[PDB]
Design a protein around this ligand. Sequence first.
Ligand code: CO
Ligand code: MN
Ligand code: MN
Length: 277
Amino acid sequence: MKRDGHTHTEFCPHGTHDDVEEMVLKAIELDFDEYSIVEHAPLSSEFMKNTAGDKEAVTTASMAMSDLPYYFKKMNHIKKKYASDLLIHIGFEVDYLIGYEDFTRDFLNEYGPQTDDGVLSLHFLEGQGGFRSIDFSAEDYNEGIVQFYGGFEQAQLAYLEGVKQSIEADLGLFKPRRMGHISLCQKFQQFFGEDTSDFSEEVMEKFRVILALVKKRDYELDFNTAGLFKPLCGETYPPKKIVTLASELQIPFVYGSDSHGVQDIGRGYSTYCQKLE
Ligand SMILES: [Co+2]
Ligand SMILES: [Mn+2]
Ligand SMILES: [Mn+2]
């Protein structure tokens, strides 16, 4: 089978603004038979008052609540239009917002019934001046998070504590069961002279605790290839060492392109197949 569990649309303010239809036609050309549209869920307006760092990381993060009816209408149209070629699932990439579980639970209880798939992703941590982005830019990550936690490794461990909290969280019946790109702390790796070759024993132990809990919860992992195409990353989320531990625990992986346009569709698919073997 050939499944992409992680794609975005014209409803993503920071994407290419390519039409989802052109992305779906490209997925069919590359022989995908299953395809999840998991657009960024709208952020809590309370959360957005409590941020620092580049405002664009927050203003551009996701669509507004008022776009949701238009999002569901468009995606449901595309799902039916291409049903004979491609099984399309509709849902969200849901932010795990530390301290805003009530907002996320209320959102999932309201809109969860309109969805068929989901990814729960950590994109924001407490940092200098308030909540800060993990994935906006190397310089913003340095100033907001790395310097705040005391260094690249301290940032890794704060990030993994957030991931662990996302797995433990009670977000009700409609909580996604697929955890998004669980090594996103490596997106700007090379800016700090870091790579996946030298994870400390403490980082490794934190990954083992996270994988044991994923297995106990019967969750699965986003095998996310976007990192291969980020100029300061060069790695899958997660890397091979983590993939091997997860596979030994029989945690399922779903390939995720994290596509924000047509050119992203299918990217790193061969690397997914090989990295699993
Ligand atoms: Co995504
Ligand atoms: Mn995005
Ligand atoms: Mn993400």
